[model samples]
Target: ELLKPRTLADLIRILHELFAGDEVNVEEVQAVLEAYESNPAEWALYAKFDQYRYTRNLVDQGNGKFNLMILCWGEGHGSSIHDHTDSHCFLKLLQGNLKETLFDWPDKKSNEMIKKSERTLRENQCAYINDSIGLHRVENVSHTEPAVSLHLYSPPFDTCHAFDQRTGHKNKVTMTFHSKFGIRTP
Candidate 1:
């Protein structure tokens, strides 16, 4: 039950379908969670040729509006503070616990966290991020355990900035490649 959605389309379809109701329902979320709980597709070669944890990006979508990605975090991999230059994103946490911090960019030069606005996503939890001053970062805070997440962005999620929490270095990068759908080829 790792966070390993193979294809961007598969990941997006799952998220859009699961969260389409707009109103978060425990039962519905739980149902989807169970379905993915034992997902037996840990067969990709992204992370050191291992399928357990990885991350990827999309180049285009069939609808031509949103690009998708499946970010797998096993044990201790997490992301840092950065905003979508021109994208609205939704994160569907498949397994494990993830802590999210939301911040508001009052201006391009300064920003601050919204008081009482931090949220925790357990199994089958989801969140939305739009371009309205979105200065946020997500992390798999579970100690000694790993988490998985699916990230979807409108107009595609290419060319963004991710910070290295350890060194506090901000770097711009692009979606490197597509996923192999957990298919191991000899």
Candidate 2:
């Protein structure tokens, strides 16, 4: 059976229960995300967007075991290829469409990346990935429309590596939230 969370708070509560186990139930989490419908009004407080880059607005920190966020992608915005830092990353498209490109892990010495696969996710569609699955770059393909996505990261991380597509060089980046708990941050 699928969970029907009427509000964002309800979703967070359900996720907290699912994550209470020794290990997160990936399938159950995905099912919850896939089943939940997007409600713009419900997430308005955390839906802030940036013109230059995509914005990550915190929804729930999950008591530090996991985190949930609303990612707002301005038109034509995209992320550099990045790794999840050993965490399970789940994404559910909330608005518009996003194109996700997967690449093979870079070589340790040369840091060269090989393109693997790519797909576009429509609203309400869910996707899951971890470091072992491969690196990914997510973009809002539409030039005229902005996109929004809900992301859940298990065993939450504060830092991750971003890779250069050409040289495959990687740099560690510290994540920052545009908003936390419905409050905007400077």
Candidate 3:
């Protein structure tokens, strides 16, 4: 017999229950992510693409605790070095692969951002990071196929800080949506 597929809403409910307590357990969240990662064909629309990449909101419980988003990346697409504005972030690769590079800002005046590490996340893999540590960049390593990922952020951010390590340029970016519940965002 074939396994039954689960929905994104179901995944959100599981996540809520896991983080409802006083403390958020990353391990439990990872477990939930692993479960859904096995089958994400139904959730591909959550990260439907328009540009080099796309980001769609999944859930935002109004208590200011956390929000969920699905990000879609096209081939050769990536993000600049950026910080989540102190948000705790969890990401699970739903399809294809992603390469993440970590950076350390040693001096603000000199604008020196040292490359710390680089890691690749394949389908069904998950990773978490805290913005208080430093900045990071994500890229879709695929040359032909698109990549999709799910991200959970504590205290959903309205704006984030992006940086240019080579030029030391930085800017604040407002979050935007690509779609919601089958409706396209403007």
Candidate 4:
């Protein structure tokens, strides 16, 4: 059966509904995220890009363990290997394409990083990663089209550990937002 497509607001409502029961199962979250549909047109305002940097636009918040954000990626822009500070994250590619690579290390202080898996995502596709999974990286692979994505995080953190793969050292990095609920983050 052909499934009817949905909008950004629809996706938001769906997420709220999914979490209403306090059941934050990882697989269940992934399943609902995959079913959500979003349009690029409605998300353009949140898709601003810097001359050479990507933008993370915070858009919504919840009481307990949920926060939503929209991130805009410029061509060739990618993230460093980072950990989510024990937060469960759901990322949905809403526009263009992105490639995510996963990594795992044997020891917390180890100098070796083991490459795991890599996946490419496009419009309406979703990906999941959590603290249990260890470190990962994401990039905008498109040379022309800018990529935009929606993120849902539980126990939303204000900081994470960014890894220096060459030396296998991790440093604390603060999470910042460009805007939230139409207000700029200062």
Candidate 5:
């Protein structure tokens, strides 16, 4: 079965295979992980953590211990200031360039979107986003085209708080805000 995964359907089929015809156990997780690791690589995951890049997507408060998402980008697209409530994340780039910006904690420090940008991947580049150590946003800095990514997390990130840059209002929402996967804000 490891020799026949090519598309998302095939990948999901692999997931189903784990539980469809066999006993559910710890090995089920191992099988799914294999499928996840074998899927086509995309860079949309980078957009989730990088500043200046907004995704028309949202992640539900998953009850599981991990979550993974894929993103697609256009010119000048970005995300809001948000954090996973007790969660950790990792990112992998699939195409174009992903710009990331880190912030300074409030104290005597001034307020500004002081940021840094880097190309996530030309074709394939990946990194881990630990909630304990990473806080930032990403954007599409391609002067010529677009990009994409893949995001993975532990125990899954379900609900999150989005910090507004203007009104400073922090709104708690679920993953339903995403326009991808047939879910969006109406």
Candidate 6:
């Protein structure tokens, strides 16, 4: 049997239903994210970009169980090395290229992060991470082009720790939304 094409709304609906359970199945959610194809037109409205930093636009709150967001990255923009708190984070590239660098958790005393792995994700590729998986930093590698990525966080968190690359010192930062429900915020 042929599968029906999925749209942005369909993705939200499917994820919402998936999170209805008491515990989220990571593997099933990952599979759903992996199978989703990027439709630029469907998400274009929420792809709000910022020249100074990446923008996180909330698409769905999943009844406070999870958050689905569209993140827009301007050329050469990137996030600081950060931990996902206790939540599960899944990222799917929707447009342009993104370089993901994974690091081992900081040392207890020195607070130094060790590089574990690094890779670039092209459009439609997905990656998953959690607090146990260590810390990571994502960047739009293109010098001239912007990038977009879809993110899903289960058991949503409002604050997370950002680590310094050189000193590995961590600071808790509050997450903010650049837009919500397709409306850009000032």
Give a tens-digit lDDT track for model 5, residues 1-186.
444345544544454444343233333333333334323332222234233444534332233434546666676776565565765554555456677655432233334434433334444455544445435667677766666655645556557766554443557877643443435444
Off by over 4 Å in 6: 1-5
* CA lDDT of every candidate: 0.54, 0.91, 0.74, 0.78, 0.50, 0.88
Candidates 2 and 3 compared by lDDT, better number: 2
lDDT of 6 by residue, 52-110 (tens): 99999998898799999999999999999999989999998989989999998887566
Q: Which portions of model 4 show Cα errors greater than 4 Å?
A: 1-5, 106-112
In candidate 4, list every pair of residues with a backbone clash. none
TM-score of 6: 0.94
TM-score of candidate 3 against the unseen true structure: 0.86
Among these predicted structures, which one has the highest lDDT? 2
Over 1-186, each residue of candidate 1 has an lDDT whose tens digit, in order, gives 224444533544555554454344444434443444423243223222223434553322525455544566656565667778676676666557788877555433333334325688876566777657466777776667667665556646567776544443557966555453443323
Candidate 3: regions farther than 4 A off:
1-7, 57-64, 167-169
Candidate 5, which segments miss by more than 4 Å at Cα? 1-63, 108-110, 116-122, 164-173, 177-186
Ranking by lDDT: 2, 6, 4, 3, 1, 5
Candidate 5 lDDT at 25 equals 38
Task: Mark the regions of model 2 whose C-alpha exceeds 4 Å error after superposition.
Answer: 109-112
Ranking by TM-score: 2, 6, 4, 3, 1, 5
Q: Judge candidate 6 at residue 130 and give its lDDT.
A: 95
As a whole number from 0 to 100, the lDDT of residue 94 in candidate 5 is: 48
Cα deviation of 40, candidate 3, in Å:
3.1
Model 6: pairs clashing at backbone N, Cα or C within 3 Å = none
